[PDB]
Structure 1
Amino acid sequence: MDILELSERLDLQRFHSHTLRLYRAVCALGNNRVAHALCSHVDQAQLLHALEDAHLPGPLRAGYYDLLISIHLESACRSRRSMLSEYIVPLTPETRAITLFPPGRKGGNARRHGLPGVGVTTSLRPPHHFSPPCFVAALPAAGVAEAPARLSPAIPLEALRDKALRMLGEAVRDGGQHARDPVGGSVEFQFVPVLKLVSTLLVMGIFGDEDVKQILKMIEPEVFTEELEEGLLQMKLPESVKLQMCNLLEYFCDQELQHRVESLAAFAERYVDKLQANQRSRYALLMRAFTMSAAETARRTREFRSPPQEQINMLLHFKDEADEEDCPLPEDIRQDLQDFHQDLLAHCGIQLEKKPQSLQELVSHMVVRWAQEDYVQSPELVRAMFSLLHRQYDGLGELLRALPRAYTISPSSVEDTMSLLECLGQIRSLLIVQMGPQEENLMIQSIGNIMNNKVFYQHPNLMRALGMHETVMEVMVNVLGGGETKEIRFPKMVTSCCRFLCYFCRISRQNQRSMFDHLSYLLENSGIGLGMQGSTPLDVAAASVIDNNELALALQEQDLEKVVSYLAGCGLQSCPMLLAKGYPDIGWNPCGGERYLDFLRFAVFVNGESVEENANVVVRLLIRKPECFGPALRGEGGSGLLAAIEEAIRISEDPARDGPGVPPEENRVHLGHAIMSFYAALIDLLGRCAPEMHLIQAGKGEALRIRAILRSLVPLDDLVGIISLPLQIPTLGKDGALVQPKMSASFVPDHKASMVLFLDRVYGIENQDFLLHVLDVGFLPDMRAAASLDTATFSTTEMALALNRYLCLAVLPLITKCAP
């Protein structure tokens, strides 16, 4: 049955239009496999012919136009639009060739502004990628979600551009004709799909430059003539048509602004070359002229003593003309740079025929004329027109807003940078979609590529501008938001998201601040995230604070409130998955509390140096929370810390008290080792929170008071017993094979060193006989053990190595202080 006939049957028209919209909905968000499936049902040539035919009804043509644009372009469309914001310019010689104003006999400012969209833009944009649609291809033997996602189906882009241009011309001609019957039954029905096609093609940039010139002529002939068709604005259009041609103008203005940005980039290249030459010459004079004059040499060296960035800065201090003479740069170079500045102002129109001759002014006039003709009834249209108007009025403002986003890249690493931009495009792609296992594999390997990139190591400021870390925390919290507590969906997601962000912590201190801005809400999510394996959001937050005293100072007492509340909660009960593991229940959670504690300890010690204010706050929170002191050393009804340690050792001895017994991941850890790990962590916090030998020698009263509370909480004789506790040593056996217990059960020298560190930090050394008794209870048994450790087979053992470690880190400084 003929489609044209369906126009008369409204029921069939509505059903088929909703069918088209259904294909549109199912294909949405770049569902590429679905799109290929539709290409099976809908022929590309069929769609093309549907565009060509004018008799076909308007809702149908809108539907088919939408299907073509989306099922083929929309993925590239969203990708390209996402990366349109970023402005990155390589230092190509071609880039150097670019200038703000086209060459000519007339002065550049007096010269006509270059025809928009025409010229060379070297902003690094990845090529569009498409897959030919073919169904005779063999079925993928590889499993689903392991093969890479299919590319969008391919369309002949050149031919599509030519036809889009052709029916664009037809639409303009018919509008001039004012024929009673519009194409598709309405003027808006006639035009709207054409402007959609033009928008998409122009934003892709496939639309060739000559054709862009043609489009400009159709929009406004008399305007874009370069040294009768009526302007599209002159034709007058319904509100929706106004909306989309306003979008076309918006694209043109964005391209124009990009051209401005690259123009300043090229001028910057020329200028920096001039500066390097001239300042080499200046320094050569300096080694020459330093013999004559010293006072000027002293200042000039001080200028060179300045960091290079500040050197650039006070070189650039010629604008005011008050100190322009002070700038070492000569008046000639200052003159040409001022000429550049005037040129930039003129191109912006900042500096000071009815037809405007300028795109910005004509757009302003069109907005004003529309608001004059009638009140706009579409709020989105109003938003669009006023945004465009404001933007055309403030080009200097657009440049202010875009300049931080701008960046320059050396030509050598252009291809690797392009690869990285492709990766970030994939990352932004997955943000819109709801998380699925194929997407999981996708962004895991994409993140891996990001780490593998050397450019990713090279320009930290450039990534900071690009914001992949922001997008990564965004996808992190999108994953986290849905039922994280009931089920930690995709620990692979959460671990990968750390690995990236955690690496970013390791990257830069400015990056550390950048994520530090989000640290509060990160910790809020990390309240349950630490239960996840190994590296957690708590761990990335810990990696953020460390290595900056300023970050440590910026640490927030309310954030400490949430963390200590979390720590108390762990002390309130054990984790439920332990029971889910068959791991027997315990009255409190040691592991999560331990992670919170180590976070706090990374917080307190920056470069091994305590933040006294932070220590005071944590002391306050501890004294509010008996659960912070924990079951051991409770006080009233208070199990001694020593007794708890021996009980934990007994539990680790006990088979199946730490195990269900009904380890593929082997992450299961003896509850004794875990609780004593928590307690060694608490002791570590408590020793680091102790005041320092300076301001103890002066003796700040609150400092000694806190120290006294610490010594009261932790009995010195109790610590003497703890250090007195012997450690099992691996021994040869069963024909002399060495017997080594598992560390997830073993009582560790790491904990013992935490004790010893607390001793030296808080109690320290007072008496020589006290030192001797401390040694003979805890240090000399360890030192006979160390003597035994010096064995060829023993020297191999990582555990004896760890003994050597913690003994040297602690016992050696103890000897240093105690030798007198």
Structure 2
Amino acid sequence: MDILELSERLDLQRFHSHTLRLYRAVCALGNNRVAHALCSHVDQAQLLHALEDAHLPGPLRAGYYDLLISIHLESACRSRRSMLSEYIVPLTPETRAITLFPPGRRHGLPGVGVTTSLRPPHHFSPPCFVAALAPARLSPAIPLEALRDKALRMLGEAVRDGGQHARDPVGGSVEFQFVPVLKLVSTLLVMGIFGDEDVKQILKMIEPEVFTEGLLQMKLPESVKLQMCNLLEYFCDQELQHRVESLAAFAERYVDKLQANQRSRYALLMRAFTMSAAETARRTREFRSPPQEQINMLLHFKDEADEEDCPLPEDIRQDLQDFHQDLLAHCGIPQSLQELVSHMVVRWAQEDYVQSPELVRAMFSLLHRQYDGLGELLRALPRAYTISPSSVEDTMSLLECLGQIRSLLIVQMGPQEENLMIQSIGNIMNNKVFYQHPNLMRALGMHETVMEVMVNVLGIRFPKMVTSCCRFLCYFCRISRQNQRSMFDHLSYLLENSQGSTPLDVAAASVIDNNELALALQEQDLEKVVSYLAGCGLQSCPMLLAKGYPDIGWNPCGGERYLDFLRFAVFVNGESVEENANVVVRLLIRKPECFGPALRGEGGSGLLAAIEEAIRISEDPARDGPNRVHLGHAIMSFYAALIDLLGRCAPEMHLIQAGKGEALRIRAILRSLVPLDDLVGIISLPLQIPTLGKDGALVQPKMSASFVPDHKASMVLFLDRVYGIENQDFLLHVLDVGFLPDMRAAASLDTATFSTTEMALALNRYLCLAVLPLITKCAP
């Protein structure tokens, strides 16, 4: 039956409307693979015909318009919208010729002008179903030119005669006549399809008097009001973009000039710095000042009471003053968009009580933007980075990757989405832009988008996502200090959620050698990290022993893993953070089980025995299983990092002579904590030697299988750091077994045949890092 017959056959009308609703549902939120199927069921013809059909009923007219937007448009519309709120501006020669007011000072039409803001293009894919038989399926294409002119033509056909007051509505009501067409036009505008002439037609249609019984004047319902609110919002956003780009253009020209006087002045000084020693010798300064302060001092003449700061010529600062006046004029500080919006909104409000809440919100958002333009400029300026013309395509790759990333937070995470995010992250890293312009990635909210993804996944299934994300965040940390600080705020989350790489690595990377951040460590965070060690002092991960394992009581596995974070958090830049010292040992002793199964208190056992355990039970593989890991060496790692953390938490010598009862009592806590003697024991507890000869074998022990030499190095560090060595007797004692025989082993490994082995190298680092410097220290 002819479809227009679904105007009296109401049951079929409702069923078919809901069928279209279901179509939009299955295609919703980026599902292009299903969008292609819907192309097959509803074609690119039927869509256009339904759009240009007047006799079709409402619930089907709106249904088909929204279906068109869902199948083809609202997957490039949302992405283009997400990236609309940032203002990267390439310093092209084209962008230089952008002035707020077109030359001739009256407002140019909004959204009609060269805009060089660096928005990336949106890709499509022809839809054919005969192709042979995943990479991201792009949205189905559609001729974006016949569609554009067609939308404009039907909008014209629906506007003025729309106000002909004819009781002929196109679709059963004024609402069903306008709402869909305006929806389509606003979507197309946001996509960046409309040229300049088409935009002029749209503006002439909205309000012909000011932009040259229009559209706003005629009678109107509420939903249509909301749609014009969206359109005018788009044009206001275009005007804001224009202000920002004009600021960028003036910035370019004004700084290309503002350097010229700096070089000229440097030449003037070099020719005449003499004759005025101590008179200009103060004025020659500001050339050794950091550059941002230099710029601030350069641009410090507005107040006219600070005008001495600026050494500029008068004309140059006049350039800035004139630009400022023009900016104010453009910002308002009818006959223009601002007054039109204001009067329109007030008239709507004062002619009827609006029951649509979102309509009210939209109205007042526009009103606020049209009374305060300078404020929105100041709130948009934080998102403004002027990239060089060369680095432009790299930014397109970056922005498309970011678009895919933030276009997956709207979809629950399966395997395909997992692979796509992991590819996107890798593509983000490889851009040299990521290295060169960290401020931009902080500006785009990158470390927040990726954080949000990680929060969603952690809030486990898909562990590789957490691994990839945390590696990305570690690189973000490492890139520059301001990023470190940036993510230091989330450290509460990044720590409370605690496999290779882990979010705890992110938390540690936040504070690697940054005194400012290291000190700022809140105490409760230090507990949170001592918890999860208290949280792992007496436990064995069920997630570890899923295979045959000895199933020991305690779990050093998580232990050392947490310990290293503290090690970073206490000792930085080759010295201790004694400010964050008492917290460390105090908190460790409040949970006196954290010092290991040994050194608890009552029931505590010999430290030499504490390692003798591993000395025996680790070296035999009879206990570990019938390959992930081996034991003991991780136990030794625990009993290493504990001592390293405590040693690092030691007061410095000049602070010892400070008589700091805090520092001295901390020394006492350390001294009662482990006996001063056991040191020489663990220093002297010997470990195996590489496969010297042995029929040329490789019986050289695996590191993960043999004793942590750095365990003994940490021992030495603790020894020389709090206990110290003060007589030749104890030095001799250590040399007897702890030092000299280790040197014999090392230089025995010095053979070209058995030096490349890892054990030799590790012993080399061990002797170089802690043994030899100590021996130098005790030489006098």
Higher mean Cα deviation, 296-305 or 759-768? 296-305
Deviates more, 1:287-296 or 1:336-345: 287-296
Which of 86, 109, 127 is the matching residue for 1:115?
109
Bigger Cα displacement from structure 2, 153-162 vs 334-343 = 334-343
**1:335 Cα deviation from its structure 2 partner:** 1.4
For the 8 Å contact 2:618–2:633, the answer to whether it is kept is yes
Pairing 1:165-184 to 2, within 5 Å after superposition = 165-184=152-171
Kept after mapping to 1: 8 A contact 2:163/2:219: no
What is the Cα deviation at residue 635 of structure 1?
Answer: 2.2
Deviation of 1:651 (Å): 1.6
CA contact (8 A) 1:88 1:406 kept: yes
Q: Cα distance 1:325–1:711, how it changes in 2: closer, same or farther (>3 A)?
A: closer
Where does residue 179 of structure 2 map in the other structure?
192
CA contact (8 A) 1:221 1:231 kept: yes
Q: Does the 8 A contact of 2:86 with 2:384 survive in 1?
A: yes
Segments of 5+ residues of structure 2 without an aligned counterpart are: none
| Conserved 8 A contact 1:726-1:781 | no
| Structure 1 residue 181, shift from structure 2 partner | 2.5
| Counterpart contact for 2:598–2:610, Cα < 8 Å | yes
- In 2: Cα distance, 1:50 partner to 1:716 partner: 89
Residue 604 of structure 1 and its aligned partner are, at CA, apart by: 0.7
Q: Match of 1:792?
A: 752
Question: Residues 169-193 of structure 1, C-alpha deviation per residue, up to 9 Å, x if partnerless?
Answer: 0110332212113111010010000
The answer (yes or no) to whether the contact 1:642–1:721 under 8 Å persists in 2 is yes
Aligned partners of 2:297 and 2:309 also within 8 Å: no
Q: CA deviation at 1:734?
A: 4.7
Shift of 1:407: 1.1
Instruction: Check whether the contact 2:594–2:600 (CA below 8 A) recurs between aligned residues.
Output: no
Render the CA deviation track for 1:247-283: whole Å, top value 9, x for unaligned.
0000000011000100011011110011111211111
Counting aligned pairs with the same residue, the percent is 100
Matches of 2:287 and 2:544, distance apart in 1: 63
Q: 1:473 aligns with which of 451, 466, 470?
A: 451
Tell me if the contact between 1:55 and 1:184 (Cα under 8 Å) persists in the aligned partners. Answer: yes
For residue 319 of structure 1, give the secondary structure of its aligned residue in structure 2.
coil
Contact 1:604/1:614 (CA < 8 Å) preserved in 2? yes
Deviation at 1:590, TM superposition (A): 0.6
Q: Shift in Å at residue 325 of structure 1? A: 4.0
For 2:732 and 2:692, the matched residues in 1 are separated by 32
Partners of 1:15 and 1:734 lie apart in 2 by: 84
Q: CA deviation at 1:777?
A: 3.0
Distance between the aligned counterparts of 1:640 and 1:570, measured in 2? 21
Alpha-carbon offset, residue 732 of structure 1: 3.2
> CA offsets per residue over residues 677-707 of structure 1, 9 Å max, x none?
1110100111001111111123211101111
Q: CA contact under 8 A between 1:447 and 1:496: conserved in structure 2? A: yes
1:426 equivalent in structure 2: 404
Question: Is the contact made by 1:659 and 1:670 (CA closer than 8 Å) also made in structure 2?
Answer: no
Q: 1:325 to 1:615 in 2, by over 3 A?
A: closer
| Cα distance, 1:594 vs structure 2 | 0.6
CA offsets 1:528-563 (integer angstroms, 9 cap, x no match): xxxxx1210001100111120010111010011111
Q: What is the match of residue 276 of structure 1?
A: 259
* 1:72 and 1:154 in contact (8 A); partners too: yes
Q: Residue 758 of structure 1: CA displacement?
A: 1.0
Structure 1 gap segments, 5+ residues each: 106-111, 140-146, 351-355, 481-487, 527-532, 661-666
| In structure 2, C-alpha distance between the alignment counterparts of 1:538 and 1:446, rounded to whole Å | 23
C-alpha displacement of 1:733: 4.8
Tell me how far apart the structure 2 counterparts of residues 560 and 497 of structure 1 sit (CA, whole Å): 24
Does residue 541 in structure 1 map to residue 471 in structure 2? no
Distance apart, 1:670 and its partner CA = 2.0
Deviation at 1:149, TM superposition (A): 1.3
Measured in 1, the distance between the counterparts of 2:278 and 2:723 equals 57
Deviations 1:19-39 (A, max 9, x none): 000011111111010100111
Q: Provide the rounded CA distance (Å) in 1 between the counterparts of 2:562 and 2:163.
A: 73
Kept after mapping to 1: 8 A contact 2:511/2:569: yes
- 2:359 corresponding residue in structure 1: 381
Q: 1:588 to 1:218 in 2, by over 3 A?
A: same
Offset at residue 581 of structure 1 (A): 2.4
Supply the distance in 1 between the matched residues of 2:699 and 2:635 (Cα, whole angstroms): 24
Distance in 2 (alpha carbons) for counterparts of 1:104 and 1:514: 46
**Per the alignment, do residues 7 and 254 of structure 1 end up closer, same or farther by CA in structure 2, a change over 3 Å counting?**
same
Per-residue CA distance 1:608-654 (angstroms, 9 max, x = gap): 32111322111111111022112112221112221121111212123
String of CA shifts for 1:774-819, please: whole Å, max 9, x gaps. 2213112212212212111122112101101111111111111111
Tell me the matched-pair count: 779
1:668 to partner: Cα distance? 2.3
Q: Note the 1:753-764 alignment, pairs <5 A.
A: 753-764=713-724
Whether the 8 Å contact between 2:160 and 2:215 is mirrored in structure 1 is no
Partner of 1:208: 195
Q: Deviations over 1:38-85 (max 9, x none)?
A: 111110111000000010010111111001011101110010000000
Alignment partner of 1:247: what SS?
helix
- In structure 2, how many angstroms separate the alpha carbons of the residues matched to 1:440 and 1:608? 40
| TM-score in terms of structure 2 length | 0.98
Deviation readout 1:151-205 (Å, 9 max, x if unpaired): 0000100111000001100110332212113111010010000011011100011
Contact kept, 8 Å, 2:182 with 2:227, in 1: the verdict is yes
The answer on whether the counterparts of 1:318 and 1:324 sit within 8 Å (CA) in structure 2 is yes
Q: Runs of 4 or more off by more than 3 Å in structure 1?
A: none
Q: In structure 2, what is the Cα distance between the partners aligned to 1:134 and 1:296? A: 79
Query: Partners of 1:275 and 1:613 in 2: how far apart?
Result: 46
Would the aligned equivalents of 1:571 and 1:587 in 2 still touch at CA under 8 Å? no
Q: Distance in 2 between matches of 1:179 and 1:298?
A: 83
SS state at 1:407 partner: coil
Structure 1: distance between partners of 2:742 and 2:321: 75
The yes-or-no answer on 1:650 pairing with 2:622 is no
Is the 1:578–1:585 contact (alpha carbons within 8 Å) kept by the matching residues of 2?
no
8 Å CA contact 1:246, 1:384 repeated in 2: yes
- Aligned partners of 1:28 and 1:296: how far apart in 2? 72
- Deviates most, 78-87 or 558-567: 558-567
The alpha carbon displacement at 1:291 in A equals 2.0
Cα distance in 1 for residues equivalent to 2:114 and 2:47? 33
Shift in alpha-carbon separation, 1:325–1:782, aligned structure 2, 3 A = closer
Task: Report the Cα offset of residue 600 of structure 1.
Answer: 0.4
TM-score scaled by length of structure 1: 0.94
Question: Equivalents in 1 of 2:398, 2:346: separation in Å?
Answer: 43
Distance of 2:251 and 2:91 partners within structure 1: 10
Query: 1:650 & 1:559 partners in 2: Cα distance?
Result: 37
1:754, distance to aligned residue in structure 2 (A) = 1.2
Q: Residues of 2 paired with 1:508 and 1:311: CA distance?
A: 22
* Residues 52 and 167 in structure 1, CA contact (< 8 A), matched pair in contact too: yes
The answer to whether the 8 A contact 2:208-2:214 is kept is yes
Contact conserved, 2:117 with 2:245, CA < 8 A, in 1?
yes
Q: Which is worse superposed, 243-252 or 646-655? A: 646-655
Contact 1:96/1:267 (8 A) holds in 2: yes
Residue 605 of structure 1 and its aligned partner are, at CA, apart by: 1.2
**Corresponding residue of 1:300:** 283
Per the TM alignment, residue 294 of structure 1 is displaced from its structure 2 partner at its CA by: 2.6
Which structure has the highest helix share of the two?
1
**2:160/2:214 contact within 8 Å kept:** no
CA contact (8 A) 1:413 1:455 kept: yes
Instruction: Supply the distance in 2 between the matched residues of 1:241 and 1:296 (Cα, whole angstroms).
Output: 71
Per the alignment, in what secondary structure is the counterpart of residue 579 of structure 1?
coil
Other structure's SS at 1:128 match:
coil
1:566-617, Cα deviation, whole Å (9 max, x unpaired): 1012112111122212222111121111111000001111113211132211
The 8 Å contact of residues 578 and 584 in structure 1, kept in 2 or not, is answered as no
Partner SS for 1:807: helix
SS in 1 for 2:533: helix
- Work out the CA distance in 2 between the residues paired with 1:280 and 1:609: 43
Structure 1 contact 651–672 (Cα < 8 Å) conserved: yes
Moved more, 256-265 or 784-793: 784-793
| 8 Å CA contact retained: 1:651, 1:658 | no
Q: Deviation per CA, 1:419-447, whole angstroms, max 9, x where unpaired?
A: 11111111111111111111111111111
Task: Please give the secondary structure, in 1, of the residue aligned with 2:581.
Answer: helix
Q: CA deviation at 1:460?
A: 1.0
CA contact (8 A) 2:54 2:171 kept: yes
